[PDB]
Design an enzyme around this catalytic site. Structure first.
Site, PDB file in Angstrom:
ATOM      1  N   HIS A 192       2.010  10.815  -9.028  1.00 44.03           N
ATOM      2  CA  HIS A 192       1.998   9.451  -9.560  1.00 44.03           C
ATOM      3  C   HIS A 192       0.919   9.223 -10.627  1.00 44.03           C
ATOM      4  O   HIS A 192       1.016   8.276 -11.399  1.00 44.03           O
ATOM      5  CB  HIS A 192       1.818   8.409  -8.443  1.00 44.03           C
ATOM      6  N   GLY A 212       3.403   5.798   3.783  1.00 44.94           N
ATOM      7  CA  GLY A 212       2.845   7.149   3.838  1.00 44.94           C
ATOM      8  C   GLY A 212       1.658   7.267   2.885  1.00 44.94           C
ATOM      9  O   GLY A 212       0.634   7.872   3.208  1.00 44.94           O
ATOM     10  N   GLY A 213       1.809   6.676   1.708  1.00 45.85           N
ATOM     11  CA  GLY A 213       0.748   6.747   0.711  1.00 45.85           C
ATOM     12  C   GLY A 213       0.913   5.699  -0.360  1.00 45.85           C
ATOM     13  O   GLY A 213       1.985   5.136  -0.524  1.00 45.85           O
ATOM     14  N   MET A 214      -0.176   5.410  -1.057  1.00 42.20           N
ATOM     15  CA  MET A 214      -0.153   4.545  -2.218  1.00 42.20           C
ATOM     16  C   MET A 214      -1.065   5.176  -3.250  1.00 42.20           C
ATOM     17  O   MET A 214      -2.232   5.463  -2.967  1.00 42.20           O
ATOM     18  CB  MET A 214      -0.610   3.106  -1.882  1.00 42.20           C
ATOM     19  N   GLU A 215      -0.506   5.378  -4.441  1.00 39.26           N
ATOM     20  CA  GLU A 215      -1.128   6.128  -5.536  1.00 39.26           C
ATOM     21  C   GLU A 215      -2.194   5.332  -6.302  1.00 39.26           C
ATOM     22  O   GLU A 215      -2.227   5.359  -7.529  1.00 39.26           O
ATOM     23  CB  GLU A 215      -0.010   6.567  -6.503  1.00 39.26           C
ATOM     24  N   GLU A 251       9.671   6.621  -9.018  1.00 34.31           N
ATOM     25  CA  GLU A 251       9.845   7.478  -7.837  1.00 34.31           C
ATOM     26  C   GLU A 251      10.629   8.754  -8.034  1.00 34.31           C
ATOM     27  O   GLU A 251      10.260   9.799  -7.496  1.00 34.31           O
ATOM     28  CB  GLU A 251      10.388   6.691  -6.643  1.00 34.31           C
ATOM     29  N   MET A 263       5.861   2.102   8.098  1.00 33.68           N
ATOM     30  CA  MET A 263       7.173   1.461   8.287  1.00 33.68           C
ATOM     31  C   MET A 263       8.327   2.437   8.423  1.00 33.68           C
ATOM     32  O   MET A 263       9.294   2.148   9.130  1.00 33.68           O
ATOM     33  CB  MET A 263       7.441   0.404   7.231  1.00 33.68           C
ATOM     34  N   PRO A 265       0.902   0.477   6.080  1.00 33.14           N
ATOM     35  CA  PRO A 265       2.369   0.368   6.215  1.00 33.14           C
ATOM     36  C   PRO A 265       3.237   1.455   5.550  1.00 33.14           C
ATOM     37  O   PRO A 265       4.450   1.489   5.770  1.00 33.14           O
ATOM     38  CB  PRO A 265       2.666  -1.042   5.653  1.00 33.14           C
ATOM     39  N   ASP A 299      10.361  -6.210  -1.038  1.00 28.72           N
ATOM     40  CA  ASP A 299      10.086  -5.526   0.232  1.00 28.72           C
ATOM     41  C   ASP A 299      11.334  -5.315   1.087  1.00 28.72           C
ATOM     42  O   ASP A 299      11.372  -4.415   1.928  1.00 28.72           O
ATOM     43  CB  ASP A 299       9.039  -6.295   1.037  1.00 28.72           C
ATOM     44  N   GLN A 330       1.512  -3.352  -4.039  1.00 25.54           N
ATOM     45  CA  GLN A 330       2.842  -2.989  -4.525  1.00 25.54           C
ATOM     46  C   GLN A 330       3.937  -3.532  -3.606  1.00 25.54           C
ATOM     47  O   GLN A 330       3.843  -3.359  -2.400  1.00 25.54           O
ATOM     48  CB  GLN A 330       2.958  -1.465  -4.693  1.00 25.54           C
ATOM     49  N   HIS A 379       2.945  14.137  -3.719  1.00 30.23           N
ATOM     50  CA  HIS A 379       3.634  12.976  -4.270  1.00 30.23           C
ATOM     51  C   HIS A 379       2.609  12.001  -4.871  1.00 30.23           C
ATOM     52  O   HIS A 379       2.764  11.529  -5.999  1.00 30.23           O
ATOM     53  CB  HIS A 379       4.418  12.281  -3.146  1.00 30.23           C
ATOM     54  N   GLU A 380       1.564  11.683  -4.114  1.00 27.40           N
ATOM     55  CA  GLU A 380       0.578  10.728  -4.629  1.00 27.40           C
ATOM     56  C   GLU A 380      -0.126  11.265  -5.871  1.00 27.40           C
ATOM     57  O   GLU A 380      -0.324  10.535  -6.853  1.00 27.40           O
ATOM     58  CB  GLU A 380      -0.408  10.302  -3.530  1.00 27.40           C
ATOM     59  N   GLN A 403      -2.653  -3.927  -0.162  1.00 27.28           N
ATOM     60  CA  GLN A 403      -1.463  -3.191  -0.567  1.00 27.28           C
ATOM     61  C   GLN A 403      -0.656  -4.131  -1.457  1.00 27.28           C
ATOM     62  O   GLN A 403       0.173  -4.914  -0.984  1.00 27.28           O
ATOM     63  CB  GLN A 403      -0.651  -2.732   0.650  1.00 27.28           C
ATOM     64  N   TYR A 423      13.956   6.934  -4.594  1.00 30.56           N
ATOM     65  CA  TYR A 423      13.319   8.244  -4.477  1.00 30.56           C
ATOM     66  C   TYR A 423      14.342   9.370  -4.602  1.00 30.56           C
ATOM     67  O   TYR A 423      14.182  10.293  -5.400  1.00 30.56           O
ATOM     68  CB  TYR A 423      12.651   8.391  -3.104  1.00 30.56           C
TER      69      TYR A 423
HETATM   70  C1  LIG Z   1      14.369  -0.365  -5.346  1.00 28.73           C
HETATM   71  C2  LIG Z   1      13.845  -0.679  -4.090  1.00 28.73           C
HETATM   72  C3  LIG Z   1      12.709  -1.491  -3.977  1.00 28.73           C
HETATM   73  C4  LIG Z   1      12.085  -2.001  -5.123  1.00 28.73           C
HETATM   74  C5  LIG Z   1      10.855  -2.907  -5.024  1.00 28.73           C
HETATM   75  C6  LIG Z   1       9.607  -2.234  -4.424  1.00 28.73           C
HETATM   76  C7  LIG Z   1       8.960  -1.226  -5.139  1.00 28.73           C
HETATM   77  C8  LIG Z   1       7.818  -0.635  -4.598  1.00 28.73           C
HETATM   78  C9  LIG Z   1       7.309  -1.035  -3.358  1.00 28.73           C
HETATM   79  O1  LIG Z   1       6.189  -0.390  -2.891  1.00 28.73           O
HETATM   80  C10 LIG Z   1       5.841  -0.517  -1.479  1.00 28.73           C
HETATM   81  C11 LIG Z   1       5.124   0.770  -1.031  1.00 28.73           C
HETATM   82  C12 LIG Z   1       5.932   2.052  -1.259  1.00 28.73           C
HETATM   83  C13 LIG Z   1       4.840   3.123  -1.110  1.00 28.73           C
HETATM   84  C14 LIG Z   1       3.539   2.393  -1.447  1.00 28.73           C
HETATM   85  N1  LIG Z   1       3.918   1.016  -1.835  1.00 28.73           N
HETATM   86  C15 LIG Z   1       7.948  -2.061  -2.650  1.00 28.73           C
HETATM   87  C16 LIG Z   1       9.101  -2.653  -3.191  1.00 28.73           C
HETATM   88  C17 LIG Z   1      12.626  -1.687  -6.380  1.00 28.73           C
HETATM   89  C18 LIG Z   1      13.757  -0.881  -6.488  1.00 28.73           C
HETATM   90 ZN   LIG Z   2       5.984   7.207  -4.868  1.00 29.94          ZN
END
Ligand SMILES: c1ccc(Cc2ccc(OC[C@H]3CCCN3)cc2)cc1
Ligand SMILES: [Zn+2]
Ligand SMILES: [Yb+3]
Ligand SMILES: [Yb+3]
Length: 606
Positions: free
Chosen positions: A296, A265-268, A315, A561, A263, A372, A133, A292-293, A131, A380
């Site tokens: 993306h 719901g989804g990752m695109e 988002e 999470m 961690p 994080d 992102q 949603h996915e 993961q 969102y």
């Molecule tokens: C506002 C809040 C967090 C961030 C950084 C951020 C962006 C994406 C993130 O992705 C984590 C999870 C969300 C769903 C799949 N990946 C994690 C932290 C930027 C602007």
């Molecule tokens: Zn998203």
């Protein structure tokens, strides 16, 4: 420039391609191999460049068939350690070279969770998933770990032969590994340029079932049948999304249902969306996550945020498209119901952080902030709310969807900022600039708290939820007898969830009220993860000791999470469960996802 990356920026050099050759060693919990980066200079006389790394062991760096000098700088907390590479020959502008880096990951890689056989469905084989992102790709391989750079990739991954590897790419065959007959090599190609956060890998005992013309669902055998049914609307949603966004460019749209500790719901991930098994409600009721996915595939993966400060672009637009997909399938009143629910979640997020907190701004400043830690519903839902307000200002959904399609087409294969978006909005709607100028842009984009104006929402489907919530909140002891299972007879699962969300916004309620709710509605029996989450939060906040083991079980038996963090936080806040919550975290910490373990620890002050 990208304040989350230590690498050379796109203005200095740009990675065009990655060829990854690696082996997944479950005995050592390491990925080992070579990352060959094709890099294009953007400068005259370029003699060095810097890459992001995090807990990587570097063996060597090879250019032109010879080892070259490199240096790892000191670790800068969650950003990792910069890697400076000394180029053997100065490059001219636009010159491209290949840099092959031999590396190994740490078992502690924040990008990875390594699962023992006991932590899987089948109980025989281990499992690995990534993961990346936002900024964890640097914890798998050295790279310019910024979404301002897009690259294609190819990969060869050696795994134990009883296991399957999948990536965010098109499968390009498998063979026995010549270096080790106990192993298989799986090959992958991603021919569309992507930001590195979209590089993904899973290895496990995976099986597949076809559910549409361009979709396989993947999971362990135990989950295949249920997943095929749960996500059977996938092709219909892809067709609607193509209508709204333009051509789907990624070839296949496969789904992977991860183990429960995934961690999010989804990752695109391109070609292979990753989802939580907490979506497996049995009735397709949590399919908006799939919508949603899917969305993306345009907003995020094609048009990409240039830095994480502009994450709302990804988002907000995706939630906007998501809600249109669900509106097309289930009606405009449903779109409004979901939109209004989203505003409620935004209210919650703003209240949690505080109305002046910098993480409640739409455009954030992540200078010296771990992405994080900033993550929340704000990008969102504040992003969605802006787009919904603009839809209403500019003449409605048909008109605004025209903008969305034009926006995707304009910025496809690019990385952009909020200013790029706003400039194009103004260009597209030039005959409505007077209306656009009525928007308080400074407030919407840069101010903390709730937006300066709330959009108009149809209330049709929400009314019953509010009415029942209010009956409970205003009930005194002598009114409790009046409640009955029949109260719920005309409420959908979505409405039950919203009734609980409305009521949770006023929690705690008196303990006797919550006991009566269980007596008459039997919410303990509901397995829908969204409903159960909110119900258990209501029970714990209202001080019902009976709910303690239920909430601890949900917090630990899955790891999404959205659910795990607030359940642990609520359990920590309840005096009766505080010590158990901490002990339970301590006991599970070593086998949790690394990011989840970090954040729950922070929440609990442990
Ligand atoms: C506002 C809040 C967090 C961030 C950084 C951020 C962006 C994406 C993130 O992705 C984590 C999870 C969300 C769903 C799949 N990946 C994690 C932290 C930027 C602007
Ligand atoms: Zn998203
Ligand atoms: Yb091929
Ligand atoms: Yb009364």
């Amino acid at each position: 420039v990208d304040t989350c990356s230590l690498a050379s920026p796109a203005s200095v050099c740009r990675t065009k391609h990655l060829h990854l050759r690696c082996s997944v060693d479950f005995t050592r919990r390491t990925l080992t191999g070579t990352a060959a980066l094709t890099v294009q200079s953007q400068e005259d006389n370029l003699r060095s460049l810097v890459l992001d790394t995090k807990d990587l062991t570097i063996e060597k760096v090879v250019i032109n068939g010879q080892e070259v000098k490199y240096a790892l700088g000191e670790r800068q907390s969650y950003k990792g350690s910069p890697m400076e590479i000394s180029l053997p020959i100065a490059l001219s502008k636009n010159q491209e070279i290949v840099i092959e880096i031999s590396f190994e990951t740490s078992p502690k890689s924040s990008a990875l969770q390594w699962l023992t056989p006991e932590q899987t469905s089948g109980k025989e084989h281990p499992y690995l998933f990534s993961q990346c992102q936002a900024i964890h790709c640097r914890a798998i391989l050295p790279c310019q770990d910024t979404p301002s750079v897009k690259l294609t990739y190819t990969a060869e991954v050696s795994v134990p032969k009883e296991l399957v590897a999948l990536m965010s790419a098109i499968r390009d065959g498998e063979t026995p590994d010549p270096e080790d007959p106990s192993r298989k090599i799986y090959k992958f190609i991603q021919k569309v340029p992507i930001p590195c956060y979209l590089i993904a890998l899973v290895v496990g005992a995976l099986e597949s079932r076809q559910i549409g013309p361009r979709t396989l669902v993947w999971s362990e055998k135990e989950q295949v049948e249920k997943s095929a049914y749960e996500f059977s609307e996938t092709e219909s949603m892809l067709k609607i999304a193509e209508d709204l966004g333009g051509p789907y460019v990624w070839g296949q749209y496969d789904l992977l249902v991860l183990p429960p500790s995934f961690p999010y719901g989804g990752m695109e991930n391109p070609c292979l969306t990753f989802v939580t098994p907490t979506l497996l409600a049995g009735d397709k009721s949590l399919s908006n996550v799939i919508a949603h996915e899917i969305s993306h595939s345009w907003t995020g993966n094609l048009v990409t945020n240039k830095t994480w400060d502009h994450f709302w672009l990804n988002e907000g637009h995706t939630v906007y498209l998501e809600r249109h997909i669900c509106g097309r399938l289930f009606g405009e009143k449903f779109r409004h119901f979901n939109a209004l629910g989203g505003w409620g979640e935004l209210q919650n997020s703003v209240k949690t952080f505080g109305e002046t907190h910098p993480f409640t701004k739409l455009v954030v400043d992540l200078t010296d902030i771990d992405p994080d830690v900033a993550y929340s519903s704000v990008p969102y839902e504040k992003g969605f709310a802006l787009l919904f307000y603009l839809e209403q200002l500019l003449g409605g959904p048909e008109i605004f969807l025209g903008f969305l399609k034009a926006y995707v087409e304009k910025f496809s294969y690019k990385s952009i900022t909020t200013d790029d978006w706003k400039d194009f909005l103004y260009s597209y709607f030039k005959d409505k600039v007077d209306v656009l100028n009525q928007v308080d842009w400074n407030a919407w984009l840069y101010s903390p708290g709730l937006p300066p104006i709330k959009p108009n929402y149809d209330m049709t489907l929400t009314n019953a939820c509010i009415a029942l919530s209010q009956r409970w909140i205003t009930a005194k002891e002598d009114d409790l007898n009046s409640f009955n299972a029949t109260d719920l007879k005309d409420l959908s699962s979505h409405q039950l969830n919203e009734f609980l969300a409305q009521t949770l916004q006023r929690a705690p309620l008196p303990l006797g009220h919550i006991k009566r709710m269980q007596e008459v509605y039997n919410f303990n029996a509901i397995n829908n993860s969204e409903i159960r989450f909110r119900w258990l939060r209501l029970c714990i906040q209202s001080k019902w000791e009976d709910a303690i083991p239920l909430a601890l079980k949900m917090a630990t038996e899955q790891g999404r999470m959205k659910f795990t963090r607030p359940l642990f936080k609520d359990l920590a806040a309840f005096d009766k469960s505080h010590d158990q919550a901490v002990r339970t975290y301590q006991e599970h910490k070593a086998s949790m996802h690394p990011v989840t373990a970090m954040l729950v620890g922070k929440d609990l002050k442990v």
